[PDB]
Amino acid sequence: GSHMGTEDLKYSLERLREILERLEENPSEKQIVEAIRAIVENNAQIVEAIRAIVENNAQIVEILRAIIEALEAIGGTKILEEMKKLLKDLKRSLERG
């Protein structure tokens, strides 16, 4: 269901190992399918986690930009130019949708 955090990944991962145990001991077609249904369900929760992390990175970028502005308004420099370069580069290579 709705994603609550990384602990969701653990509970689906550990349940994934439980299904694997049943598989190695008592193989069966229905069980191979069961394990695949579980992997899918596990992957859908991994995507949500990565999605949320990507949005967090985007928000962090905006905060870093505002910090640069505040630093420029306060102290007016070489380091400031260096930071803006990194932020530009990060903006260019940022993982997004």
| Site residues (vs a second copy, CB under 8 A) | 4-7, 9-10, 13, 16-17, 20, 23-24, 27, 29-30, 32-33, 35-37, 39-40, 42-44, 46-47, 49-57, 59-64, 66-67, 69-71, 73-75, 77, 79-80, 82-83, 86-87, 89-90, 93-97
Residue closer to a second copy (CB basis): 1 or 6: 6
Contact by Cβ (8 Å): 68, 83: yes
Alpha carbons within 13 angstroms on the beta-carbon side of residue 15 total 16
Query: At its nearest, how many Å lie between a second copy and the CB of residue 63?
Result: 5
φ and ψ at residue 3, rounded to 5 degrees: -85, 130
SS3 state at 28: coil
Query: At its nearest, how many Å lie between a second copy and the CB of residue 84?
Result: 10
SS3 state at 3: coil
